[PDB]
Amino acid sequence: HWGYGKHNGPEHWHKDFPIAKGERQSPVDIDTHTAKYDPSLKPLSVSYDQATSLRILNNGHAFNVEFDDSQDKAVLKGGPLDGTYRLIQFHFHWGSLDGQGSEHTVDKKKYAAELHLVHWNTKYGDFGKAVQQPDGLAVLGIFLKVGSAKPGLQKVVDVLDSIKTKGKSADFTNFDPRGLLPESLDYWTYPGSLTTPPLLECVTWIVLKEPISVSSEQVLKFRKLNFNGEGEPEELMVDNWRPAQPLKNRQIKASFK
Ligand SMILES: O=C(O)c1cc(O)ccc1O
Ligand SMILES: O=C(O)c1cc(O)ccc1O
Ligand SMILES: [Zn+2]
Numbered sequence: 001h002w003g004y005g006k007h008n009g010p011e012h013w014h015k016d017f018p019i020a021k022g023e024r025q026s027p028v029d030i031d032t033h034t035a036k037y038d039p040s041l042k043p044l045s046v047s048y049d050q051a052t053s054l055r056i057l058n059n060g061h062a063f064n065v066e067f068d069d070s071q072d073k074a075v076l077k078g079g080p081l082d083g084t085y086r087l088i089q090f091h092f093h094w095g096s097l098d099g100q101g102s103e104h105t106v107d108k109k110k111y112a113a114e115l116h117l118v119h120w121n122t123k124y125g126d127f128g129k130a131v132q133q134p135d136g137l138a139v140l141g142i143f144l145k146v147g148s149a150k151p152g153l154q155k156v157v158d159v160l161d162s163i164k165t166k167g168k169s170a171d172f173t174n175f176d177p178r179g180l181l182p183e184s185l186d187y188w189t190y191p192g193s194l195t196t197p198p199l200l201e202c203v204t205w206i207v208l209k210e211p212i213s214v215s216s217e218q219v220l221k222f223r224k225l226n227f228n229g230e231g232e233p234e235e236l237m238v239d240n241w242r243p244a245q246p247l248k249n250r251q252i253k254a255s256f257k
Contacts (some may be wrong), residue, residue, distance in 0.1 A: 002017075002197050003061070003203065003227060004061075004227075004239055004240050004241075008036060010242045010243060012207070013197055013199065014038075014090055016065070017057065017198050017199045018026070018195045019193070019198070019199050019201065020083070020199050021201070021217075022193070022199070022201055023201070023248050023249065023252055024192050024193060025192060025193050025199065025201070025245035026103070026106040026192030026193045026194070026203065026242075026245065027105070027205075027242060027243075027244055027245065028190065028204060028216035028244050028246075028247050028250075028252070029101035029104070029105045029106075029107075029108055030104055030105065030188050030207065030252055031252070032106060032107055033107075034251075035188055035251075035252040035253060035254045036081075036153070036251065036253055037253070037254045038074070038255065039257075041079050041080055041189070041253065042077075042079060043078050044078045044185045044187065044206065044255065045075075045076070045077045045078040045079075046076055046140070046181065046185065047074070047075050048074045048078075048087070048177050049052060049251070050073040050074060051074035051087060051176065051178075052068040052173075053065055053066070053067055053068075053172050053174065053175040053196070054067065054068055054072070054171075054172065054173060054179075055169050055170065055171060055172050056156070056162040056163060056169060056170050057162075057163070057217070058143075058164070058165060058166055058167065058169070058226075059166065059195060060167070060227055060228075061168030062091040062093060062238055063091060063092075063160070063225065064089045064090070064091045065089060065090050065091070065156065065172060066089045066172075067087050067088055067089060069087065069088045069120075069127075070227070072084075072086065072122070073087075074086065074087035074177070075087070075119070076117075076119050076140060076206075077099055078152050079156045079206055079255060080189045080253070081138055081204060082135070083121060083122065083123055084121075084122045085119035085121050085122065085137070086119055086122050087117060087118070088118055088119060089118050090115060090116060090177060090180075091115075091118075092113050092114065092115045092140045092144075093113060093114050093115055093116050093195075093240050093241040093242075094113035094144075094219060094222050094223065094238065094239075094240065095110075095112060095113065095239050095241065096223065096236075096238035096239050098112045098146045098216070099220065100112075100239070100241070101113040101144075102114035102144075103195050103241045103242055103243075103244075104141060104205075104244070105244055106143075106209075110184075110213075111143040111211060112144050112145055112146050112219055113143075113214070113219060113222070114139070114142065114144065114241070115143075115212075115255050116139050116140070116141055116195075117139065117140040117142070117145060117177065117180075118137065118139050119137065119138045119139070119140070120136060120137055121133070121134060121136050121137065121138070124136055128204065129201050131194075132202075134201065135202070135204065136202040136203075137194075137202045137203045138203065138204045138205075138206060139203050139206070139210065140200070140206050141205060141206065141207040141213060142181070142182065142207075142208050142211070143207075143208070143211035143212070144213075144214050145211045145212075146211055146214060146216050147213035147215070148213045148215060149213075149214060149215035149229060150180070150212050150213060150215075150218065151179065151195060152178070152180055153174055153179070153180060153218055154218070156175070157218050157221045157222070157252040159222055160224065160225060161224075162167075163225075164198045164224070164225060164230075164232070165228060165229050166226065166227065166230075167229055168228040168230070181214065182208060182210040182211065183210060184208070184210040185208065185209065185210040185255075186210065186255055186256040187207055187208050187209060187254075187255045188209065188255070189204065189207070189250050189252070189253050190250050190251065190252065190253065191203070191204060191205070191250060192205050192229075192250075195242045197243075209256070223237070223238045224236070225237035227240075244245060
């Protein structure tokens, strides 16, 4: 099945998922000079005070922090979005080295990692119906650079030893995703896709300009995770990023002047 290796990585995905070569694939490179400020963007609203985390799962590709999305509780709205999108999970992509790891790039610059907070449009009832729609999802993308530690990430780092291998999960209640956000909500936005199979073209991407800093020790613990299952040969979970895809007939808009 699919993965990030030589024989099952991003260059092979198109054979099972032809949309890999579609008209609005993600990630992309963000050319900061070509992005245009958009005065029609409404203020972005990230409302995570009642977020209710449940569980953290190693899915053999990344790890997901999963949320209870059964009530109206952790929502993203405003900016380019019409209506209200509800948080369902977050996950990361990261490298084997600090020089690479992010999926989006900024003027071809790769950050050490990238955080994706995934939300579905509540007009569609749940995530499964949302991913049948061109505006079903919104992903808030946040770059990570290596420098000072991010204190709000440490509860994630410390639980990773308990989910080292594919299929393992752990209770992960009361985690506050507000502690993962940078100061500024300045962002770039464009229409694109999920960045793993099935690569569905449902996503309004909102990529924050300001990275968060995490420590070298925090990212090193991400790289101790495994893609393999328990009792299988070790294949460290590193370089679980898809490279930038063709922009095609898209424009990237900036929320800032
Ligand atoms: O993601 C995978 O399944 C994978 C498998 C490999 O054999 C080597 C690197 C990988 O990232
Ligand atoms: O971001 C992704 O690639 C993604 C893929 C899925 O199949 C489900 C949720 C996701 O967020
Ligand atoms: Zn992702």
